[PDB]
Paper text:
Many of currently used antibiotics inhibit protein synthesis in pathogenic microorganisms by targeting their 70S ribosomes, which are complex macromolecular machines responsible for this process. The catalytic peptidyl transferase center (PTC) located at the heart of the large ribosomal subunit (50S in bacteria) polymerizes amino acids into polypeptides in the order specified by the nucleotide sequences of the translated mRNAs. Newly-made proteins emerge from the ribosome through the nascent peptide exit tunnel (NPET) that spans the body of the large ribosomal subunit beginning at the PTC and ending on the opposite side of the large ribosomal subunit facing the cytoplasm. Here, we discover that well-known ribosomal antibiotics, hygromycin A (HygA) and macrolides, which target peptidyl transferase center and peptide exit tunnel, respectively, can act cooperatively against susceptible and drug-resistant bacteria.
Residue numbers in the entry:
A (entry chain 1D): 2 to 276
B (entry chain 17): 1 to 48
RNA sequence: GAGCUAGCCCUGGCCAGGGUGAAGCUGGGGUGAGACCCAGUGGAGGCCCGAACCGGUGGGGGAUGCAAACCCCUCGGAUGA
RNA sequence: GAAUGCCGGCAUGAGUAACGAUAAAGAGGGUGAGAAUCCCUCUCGCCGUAAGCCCAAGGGUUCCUACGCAAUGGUCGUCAGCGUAGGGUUAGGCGGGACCUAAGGUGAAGCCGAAAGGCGUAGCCGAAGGGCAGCCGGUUAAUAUUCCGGCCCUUCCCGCAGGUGCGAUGGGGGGACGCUCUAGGCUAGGGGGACCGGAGCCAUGGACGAGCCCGGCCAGAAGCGCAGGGUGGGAGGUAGGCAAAUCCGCCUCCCAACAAGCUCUGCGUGGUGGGGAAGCCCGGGUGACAACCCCCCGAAGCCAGGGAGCCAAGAAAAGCCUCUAAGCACAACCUGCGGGAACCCGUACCGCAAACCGACACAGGUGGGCGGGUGCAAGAGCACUCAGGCGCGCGGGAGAACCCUCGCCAAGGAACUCUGCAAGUUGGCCCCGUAACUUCGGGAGAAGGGGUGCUCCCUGGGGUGAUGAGCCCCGGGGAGCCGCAGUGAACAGGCUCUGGCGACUGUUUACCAAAAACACAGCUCUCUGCGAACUCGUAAGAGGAGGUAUAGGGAGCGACGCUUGCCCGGUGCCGGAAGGUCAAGGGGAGGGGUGCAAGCCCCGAACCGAAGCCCCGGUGAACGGCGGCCGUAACUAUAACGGUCCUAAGGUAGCGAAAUUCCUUGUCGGGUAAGUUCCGACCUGCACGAAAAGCGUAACGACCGGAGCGCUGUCUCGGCGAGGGACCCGGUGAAAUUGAACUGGCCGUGAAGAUGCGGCCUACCCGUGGCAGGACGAAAAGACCCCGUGGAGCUUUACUGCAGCC
RNA sequence: CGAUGUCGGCUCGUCGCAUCCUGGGGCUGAAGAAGGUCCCAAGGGUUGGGCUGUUCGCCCAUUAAAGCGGCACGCGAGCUG
RNA sequence: UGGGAGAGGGUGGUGGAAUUCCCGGAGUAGCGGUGAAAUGCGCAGAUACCGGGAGGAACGCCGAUGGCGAAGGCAGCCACCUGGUCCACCCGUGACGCUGAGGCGCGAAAGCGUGGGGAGCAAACCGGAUUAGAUACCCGGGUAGUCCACGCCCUAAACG
RNA sequence: CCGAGGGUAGGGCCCGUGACUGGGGCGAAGUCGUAACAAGGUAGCUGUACCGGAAGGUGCGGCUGGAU
């Protein structure tokens, strides 16, 4: 569960923190971290291209194995479960009987001391990774590749999962976390189970300072600006939008679909997201 | 109160310096222009 | 032209002293087991008071100024966005 | 002769303002042509978490000495950061480079762009981060971790001896890390000593004393001791660490294991080298053969890569160690020792400032370290004071008005005023005690009150010792003494009740607004399946994100509580394979020009032919919208009810004379002697109302209202006093402004407000201190207002394009 | 319009008189006392407070009375704002 | 000690029917709905039929006037964990008992909080009818909710 | 020293009263409809929720104290 605080400050009244219960090791593997280069939202031109970014806690990037078909047949003991500042999921340190060490994201139910393996022959058990062809229809699954050998791209956030719905030719049909129904190639790997830390979404940041720790700088409403700045700028006193609600750049931001029209992947998307 | 000129020798040399001017088309035109005018100093003096 | 200013990035540095006393932990009480209650321990916080430091609330002065924004008194923050 | 013309010169204001912090001066002696201002002595004052010392920027000779005083210095000048000249900066160990990487910059490969150029993995560059070997003292007018002295140390080269499978830009380990809190043991620093050293002193009533005053250390290789840091050992297996590996990783077995061991650092000791006060003698000499000891306090510093807790999860690379590959194994490397070698740049001086940034020797700005003592609960606060540094580069008088800053005040006590604006009051610590309300934290320092000095006596626990004395810390009880007064000086909340707005801490209009504005956690809509959407870019490339729907973008709303109604006709958005319209293009009935002709050329109907628009639906926390009239109930009044027009539908809950109410100071109630404000009500709401959210809400606020208590020079109503000015004298000496002036009052007149015209009145000539009614006084070619077929920012269903998208 | 600063307050007055009071009168539906109304008269006087930025006005407590106007709606090189 | 019957409870699994929706085929002029209608859906190809898929909820026959529980209440099937209760033997203990103010626990539905899920149904709501009117009853739509987890709420014609 | 009490300050309980407001009782000669009693013309009652001029309606679950 999430952890609450007595209201001994105005912010502790609402602040909630992760319990960190599954975490068994509080330092990262030295050989598996590299420095994460904070960007502040700036690109190679030095221009802000994603507003309101910067100033968050320093972080080291843990190298994550998003392939796993890298090491078919070679089992590994789950050595630890660790905090990762770069993602919402926890991470699991795997000690391969190879001697090799790698991190994967921690499935829900993973136990330190258990073993996992990857390959067409892997048992359908939590933590193992198989090509989608060989996972039974109906089993929930995470860290799914989108195309073969290109790396796990789907269902990586805390608590998420995709469900195998059926088969058709070289493809399996997944329900993604968004609810979209999509054909994914059967040679795409996936790891059985759902991502752990499902309580992530129940966290209450509690105070403005917490967003700042995360590198989230304050967001400014278009309504608070001037016409030079934003479609919603200006007006005497407060003002309603007085036009269809728009982005800083003028496009409408209430319903306007934005997926590219003739995109080749539409042939593989059966049903747009629900909800 | 704090004013606009806060001398810094590295900052001066790296910004207006001879090597800074030669890197860029606009900077080379500055040098070309100051030589044509006959300036005694083509580039700000900074002691290094 | 970002040696002023605004934002971010990398790497350093700084924040006297005092106050409040969260969680947890231990002991006791309680119970079928519990919740929980009490004491001690503990030392949390965009917590409190207050220097440095960062400010600039009210008033007075200054107004060919000491100063093209200053001075005095008072005042806000001061482990944090 | 005028252009608020241009350049220059010189006036007026004027011997006027001013001479730059109110920390403060006085005298004697000297120097010199000249002295308040330079030197010296004594006295006085100011700083002392600095106004003292050290370092880094920046500055660039300003440093030291001699000789000068025209100018610079707000006066003076014999002086000086000024003029002339001469001298002065010394490094293997300090800092930087011959080392390493960070952001970033550059950039083989590669990619992109009309040109110029933009990117770009590696690599390279890039530091105040990593790494790396010097401490104490002496010396100069001026440099010193640099010279000298003592004791240490580093690298490279060569050699010797011993040892080893040696060998790297390759593999591995390590380097290597947060915040808060913190243990033990030390050190820096400090306090005390009846002990050790010392020149001396006995005053003015007393003291020859366990008297006063002064000092009582610093560095130091090996070794040793104390305290810490780091680190398990052996074998077997091995498929991973882009080759190899004995290394590292993984598995298993064996002893070891909060130990020791090994290793590294700090501290102490340590051969040795130094230093060494007051006082009084002309920076030096003496003190002095100086002594150099004991106790207490004690770091934020050290051991350190220590420990614990927590979530926001806390650089890289090289040095270093290990592994092996080519190689090479008469080499090579490792260890010890010895000799030799060891480069370039900085070093003066100022450095919270008269030498830096501010045009000035400018009350402003400027990063790091040291920053002593006593007392006040603590402290870097406050008062005083050490070391050290200053009295702020005009002075001397005077003792008006007025001004500033300050002190006090009879009686009253907010009567002041827009407002208690301002100023009083309160004020630290210890104890007692503390309300509504509440989100159970708070509200709270609520409020309110008691205590507070000194002396003697008895006593409780702690630290250091030893368990004791001594020192040091925290107490408790009794009895007394003095004053107006005991946080006796300085530093140190006035309080309460009640509304509005915003939940809160935060942010903002640098330099007229700090707020109710922005942000904010939180809520909802919406886009986005990842080569994501979106953003910057012509592109390449980037951000997003080395993220993946519990995620990322956009929008609104803004903790939390209780909620968020009706209208989808119009606009937006979403869905709709029909239909209508629809461009290029396709098609080619039909027709035309020309040729003797084959032919060449042109026009061109039906039909086919996208998005878009039309059309059909959906959609409100999308843009938005949310009525009128007539009638009707046992008195009146009103209208639950009915009728009727219109609309897409007619405002629900809640709230309401409100940050909204025109009429308006609505009406009524409350408070007041009296209340246009305030609070509580009512509801004909000119013109509230539900995420441009509605109604509440504990806590919070330098926000904006209303009231009371305390207390006051705010006021009745003013008075006195202080200092800095104002005034006088000596020194230096501005300014805007200025058509010229020999520049009075009234009543008139005049372009309609006359010193300047008329008539009359008044008036000897010239200043000084004062006051502001006039000179339509100064300043700024009015910001308002209009005008100009003047400009610019902004908007949109103005026009017309363009990017972007389809 | 190459600038003639504005409401209200404070301060400081001075003037007019169509007089609020005080002095002198005539008429009265003037018995007295007190008023009413007109005439003469500008010498002096013409309060403190609550509300509101207010001028004004209303109200409280008084008063002989609580006058009305002008002076760039007197007076910002006098202050406030 | 030995046996029994049971929708007693909790957990994890798991089956088939049906409704709805979506895809493919086939097919066309209506379907639906009512007392009778209309709104509604339908030539943009509905209904009716075949095949395929998704998803939630409830478990037909057995089923009974039946069974179990203290009450609320419990119904496909399997497994595990677990309560109560009856019987036979008449073996053990030796009045160890009954009740029970307070206390504690449980407590249908609706409702509330956080998150999930959402097929059918359906307060509110919109529309069609009915009617003198019809803020109803009937019809076509439709959001909470109904379902799951956790935490509350603690009521009832909680009745025999 | 204690001490009647007086004073300052802050709490507790009770009473009276208050612009205005909430429903309640009664009156009865009114307006609206007809919710319950019959199958009361939608069987009723019910806890709860949402809604409506009003009685009441609907939903979910419960009871029979329901006609046929
Ligand atoms: Mg958990
Ligand atoms: Mg909490
Ligand atoms: Mg807590
Ligand atoms: Mg808690
Ligand atoms: Mg709070
Ligand atoms: Mg609080
Ligand atoms: Mg936690
Ligand atoms: Mg965890
Ligand atoms: Mg760490
Ligand atoms: Mg690394
Ligand atoms: Mg990275
Ligand atoms: Mg990055
Ligand atoms: Mg770059
Ligand atoms: Mg660039
Ligand atoms: Mg952006
Ligand atoms: Mg940004
Ligand atoms: Mg994590
Ligand atoms: Mg989490
Ligand atoms: Mg959240
Ligand atoms: Mg972060
Ligand atoms: Mg955000
Ligand atoms: Mg915002
Ligand atoms: Mg604005
Ligand atoms: Mg702009
Ligand atoms: Mg624009
Ligand atoms: Mg715009
Ligand atoms: Mg707008
Ligand atoms: Mg507007
Ligand atoms: Mg606006
Ligand atoms: Mg408005
Ligand atoms: Mg605005
Ligand atoms: Mg606005
Ligand atoms: Mg606003
Ligand atoms: Mg608007
Ligand atoms: Mg709007
Ligand atoms: Mg609009
Ligand atoms: Mg794809
Ligand atoms: Mg600077
Ligand atoms: Mg400079
Ligand atoms: Mg520099
Ligand atoms: Mg520099
Ligand atoms: Mg620089
Ligand atoms: Mg340069
Ligand atoms: Mg020049
Ligand atoms: Mg030359
Ligand atoms: Mg140049
Ligand atoms: Mg800058
Ligand atoms: Mg850093
Ligand atoms: Mg601090
Ligand atoms: Mg405690
Ligand atoms: Mg603990
Ligand atoms: Mg704080
Ligand atoms: Mg604090
Ligand atoms: Mg504080
Ligand atoms: Mg700042
Ligand atoms: Mg100020
Ligand atoms: Mg003040
Ligand atoms: Mg003053
Ligand atoms: Mg000024
Ligand atoms: Mg000041
Ligand atoms: Mg000051
Ligand atoms: Mg203060
Ligand atoms: Mg503070
Ligand atoms: Mg502090
Ligand atoms: Mg803070
Ligand atoms: Mg002329
Ligand atoms: Mg002129
Ligand atoms: Mg001129
Ligand atoms: Mg001129
Ligand atoms: Mg000129
Ligand atoms: Mg003069
Ligand atoms: Mg002073
Ligand atoms: Mg002199
Ligand atoms: Mg002289
Ligand atoms: Mg001297
Ligand atoms: Mg001191
Ligand atoms: Mg200079
Ligand atoms: Mg020197
Ligand atoms: Mg001179
Ligand atoms: Mg001279
Ligand atoms: Mg000369
Ligand atoms: Mg001079
Ligand atoms: Mg000067
Ligand atoms: Mg001389
Ligand atoms: Mg000088
Ligand atoms: Mg010399
Ligand atoms: Mg040397
Ligand atoms: Mg070399
Ligand atoms: Mg390099
Ligand atoms: Mg380098
Ligand atoms: Mg360096
Ligand atoms: Mg060095
Ligand atoms: Mg040394
Ligand atoms: Mg020297
Ligand atoms: Mg080797
Ligand atoms: Mg690291
Ligand atoms: Mg570091
Ligand atoms: Mg911190
Ligand atoms: Mg300690
Ligand atoms: Mg001491
Ligand atoms: Mg020790
Ligand atoms: Mg191997
Ligand atoms: Mg000596
Ligand atoms: Mg001697
Ligand atoms: Mg001697
Ligand atoms: Mg001796
Ligand atoms: Mg500290
Ligand atoms: Mg540690
Ligand atoms: Mg976290
Ligand atoms: Mg790197
Ligand atoms: Mg070989
Ligand atoms: Mg060796
Ligand atoms: Mg060289
Ligand atoms: Mg050199
Ligand atoms: Mg030097
Ligand atoms: Mg300063
Ligand atoms: Mg400094
Ligand atoms: Mg000076
Ligand atoms: Mg200065
Ligand atoms: Mg010291
Ligand atoms: Mg004190
Ligand atoms: Mg103190
Ligand atoms: Mg202070
Ligand atoms: Mg002292
Ligand atoms: Mg002085
Ligand atoms: Mg005088
Ligand atoms: Mg007085
Ligand atoms: Mg008073
Ligand atoms: Mg009083
Ligand atoms: Mg006030
Ligand atoms: Mg005080
Ligand atoms: Mg109270
Ligand atoms: Mg409480
Ligand atoms: Mg108090
Ligand atoms: Mg209070
Ligand atoms: Mg005394
Ligand atoms: Mg005191
Ligand atoms: Mg005091
Ligand atoms: Mg006193
Ligand atoms: Mg003081
Ligand atoms: Mg205070
Ligand atoms: Mg209050
Ligand atoms: Mg108000
Ligand atoms: Mg409010
Ligand atoms: Mg606020
Ligand atoms: Mg605000
Ligand atoms: Mg709130
Ligand atoms: Mg706030
Ligand atoms: Mg703060
Ligand atoms: Mg401002
Ligand atoms: Mg401004
Ligand atoms: Mg400005
Ligand atoms: Mg400005
Ligand atoms: Mg201001
Ligand atoms: Mg402001
Ligand atoms: Mg503020
Ligand atoms: Mg703002
Ligand atoms: Mg805001
Ligand atoms: Mg909200
Ligand atoms: Mg762009
Ligand atoms: Mg572009
Ligand atoms: Mg790219
Ligand atoms: Mg990227
Ligand atoms: Mg990236
Ligand atoms: Mg992402
Ligand atoms: Mg808020
Ligand atoms: Mg906001
Ligand atoms: Mg807002
Ligand atoms: Mg509440
Ligand atoms: Mg409605
Ligand atoms: Mg609409
Ligand atoms: Mg529409
Ligand atoms: Mg409609
Ligand atoms: Mg429109
Ligand atoms: Mg058709
Ligand atoms: Mg033809
Ligand atoms: Mg022809
Ligand atoms: Mg809604
Ligand atoms: Mg409309
Ligand atoms: Mg709207
Ligand atoms: Mg009637
Ligand atoms: Mg009203
Ligand atoms: Mg209101
Ligand atoms: Mg407002
Ligand atoms: Mg209004
Ligand atoms: Mg109006
Ligand atoms: Mg009004
Ligand atoms: Mg009004
Ligand atoms: Mg009134
Ligand atoms: Mg008021
Ligand atoms: Mg007001
Ligand atoms: Mg009314
Ligand atoms: Mg808005
Ligand atoms: Mg508003
Ligand atoms: Mg709205
Ligand atoms: Mg505030
Ligand atoms: Mg405020
Ligand atoms: Mg006065
Ligand atoms: Mg005095
Ligand atoms: Mg005086
Ligand atoms: Mg004076
Ligand atoms: Mg005086
Ligand atoms: Mg004289
Ligand atoms: Mg003349
Ligand atoms: Mg005239
Ligand atoms: Mg005249
Ligand atoms: Mg005249
Ligand atoms: Mg004349
Ligand atoms: Mg004439
Ligand atoms: Mg004349
Ligand atoms: Mg006259
Ligand atoms: Mg005048
Ligand atoms: Mg004047
Ligand atoms: Mg004149
Ligand atoms: Mg004048
Ligand atoms: Mg004038
Ligand atoms: Mg002009
Ligand atoms: Mg003009
Ligand atoms: Mg103009
Ligand atoms: Mg105007
Ligand atoms: Mg005009
Ligand atoms: Mg025109
Ligand atoms: Mg014209
Ligand atoms: Mg324009
Ligand atoms: Mg777009
Ligand atoms: Mg004008
Ligand atoms: Mg002029
Ligand atoms: Mg002018
Ligand atoms: Mg009579
Ligand atoms: Mg007469
Ligand atoms: Mg008179
Ligand atoms: Mg007169
Ligand atoms: Mg008034
Ligand atoms: Mg009025
Ligand atoms: Mg009135
Ligand atoms: Mg009277
Ligand atoms: Mg007047
Ligand atoms: Mg007028
Ligand atoms: Mg007027
Ligand atoms: Mg006037
Ligand atoms: Mg005036
Ligand atoms: Mg003025
Ligand atoms: Mg005025
Ligand atoms: Mg004037
Ligand atoms: Mg004037
Ligand atoms: Mg005023
Ligand atoms: Mg104003
Ligand atoms: Mg049955
Ligand atoms: Mg028996
Ligand atoms: Mg229940
Ligand atoms: Mg339920
Ligand atoms: Mg429910
Ligand atoms: Mg649904
Ligand atoms: Mg009707
Ligand atoms: Mg609802
Ligand atoms: Mg709901
Ligand atoms: Mg029953
Ligand atoms: Mg008495
Ligand atoms: Mg009924
Ligand atoms: Mg009936
Ligand atoms: Mg019935
Ligand atoms: Mg209702
Ligand atoms: Mg009605
Ligand atoms: Mg209904
Ligand atoms: Mg029942």
């Amino acid at each position: 569960a999430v952890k609450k605080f007595k209201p001994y400050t105005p912010s502790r009244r609402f602040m909630t923190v992760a319990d960190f219960s599954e975490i068994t090791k509080t330092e990262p593997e030295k050989s598996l971290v590299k420095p994460l280069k904070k960007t502040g939202g700036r690109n190679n031109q030095g221009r802000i291209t994603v507003r309101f970014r910067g100033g968050g806690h320093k972080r080291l990037y843990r190298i994550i194995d998003f392939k796993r078909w890298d090491k078919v047949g070679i089992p590994a003991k789950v050595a630890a479960i660790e905090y990762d500042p770069n993602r919402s999921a926890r991470i699991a340190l795997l000690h391969y009987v190879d001697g090799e060490k790698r991190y994967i994201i921690a499935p829900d139910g993973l136990q330190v001391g258990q073993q996992v393996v990857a390959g067409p022959d892997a048992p359908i058990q939590v933590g193992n990774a198989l090509p989608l062809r060989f996972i039974p229809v109906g089993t929930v699954v995470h860290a799914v590749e989108l195309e073969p050998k290109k790396g796990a791209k789907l269902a990586r956030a805390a608590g998420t999962s995709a469900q195998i719905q059926g088969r058709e030719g070289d493809y399996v049909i997944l329900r993604l976390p968004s609810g979209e129904l999509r054909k994914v190639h059967g040679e795409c790997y996936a790891t059985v189970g759902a991502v752990g830390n499902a309580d992530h979404k129940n966290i209450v940041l509690g105070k403005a300072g917490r967003s700042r720790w995360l590198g989230r700088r304050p967001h400014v409403r278009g309504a608070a600006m001037n016409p030079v700045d934003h479609p919603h700028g200006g007006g005497e006193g407060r003002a309603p939008r007085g036009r269809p609600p728009a982005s800083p750049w003028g496009w409408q931001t209430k319903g306007l679909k934005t997926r590219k029209r003739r995109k080749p992947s539409s042939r593989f998307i059966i049903a747009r997201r629900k909800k | 109160m704090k004013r606009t000129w806060q001398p810094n020798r590295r900052k001066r040399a790296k910004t207006h310096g001879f090597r800074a001017r030669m890197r860029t088309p606009g900077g080379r035109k500055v040098l070309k222009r100051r030589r044509q005018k006959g300036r005694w100093r083509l580039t700000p003096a900074v002691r290094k």
